[PDB]
Amino acid sequence: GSMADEATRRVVSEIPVLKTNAGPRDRELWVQRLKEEYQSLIRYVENNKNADNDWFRLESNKEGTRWFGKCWYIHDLLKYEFDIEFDIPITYPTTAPEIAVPELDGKTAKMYRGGKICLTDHFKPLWARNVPKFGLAHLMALGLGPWLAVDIPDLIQKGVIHHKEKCNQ
Ligand code: NA
Structure with missing residues (x-):
């Protein structure tokens, strides 16, 4: 729908789009895909720094x-790390990678086996209709990003996790 699009x-407009439909076994085409992956990641990071959201x-x-x-999350002036x-699936970029946050494994009922985070029912369709334009920068922006903004506040409220340090030190 109009709202989803x-x-x-809004989230991914200034993230470079990827082109090469190649997975980890595709040799010279995988090397080119990896160039597009790093191109996209570093511009996303550069954009994040300018937005005071280098995360x-x-x-x-x-x-x-x-x-x-690592990822970082700020909540009530405390910084969580x-x-x-x-791993890259063999069938990537059609198959999205599964992000693990291993230190939360067995520690919360939010985790799948291997401390793998559950994205929403709307992530896989969103990824599916963008193949092969979305890459690891888009996995971070649209998958892990929203996940941190829901689940980390929740784990703090439940007192499951503690912080690393105060914010402006
Ligand atoms: Na989860």
Whole structure:
């Protein structure tokens, strides 16, 4: 609908779109896809810094098949930090990667096996109708971003998680 399309555009308008339909086994086409992935990620990060919302770091192994980093979330002037990681599915970019936040695994009934976060029923269709334009920057912006803004406040209220540090120090 009009609202979904507009809401998606608002979030990802200045994130570079990806082109190459290639997964981790596609050799020279995967190398090109990885270039588009890094191009998109770094511009997203650069845009986030200018918006005082620099909220994650990601790096990959040599092959670009395993990604890892951290995300940060600010709530009531306290800063929360979480390790994140995912593997690239063989059928990516058609199949979205599954984000794990391993330190929350077994610790909350929000986690699937391997500390994998549950995105909403609307994430997979949204990803599906954008293949192959969406990449890891879009997984962060449209998947993990909204997840932090729902689930982290909830875990703080339930007293499941503690902070790392105060904000403006
Ligand atoms: Na979850």
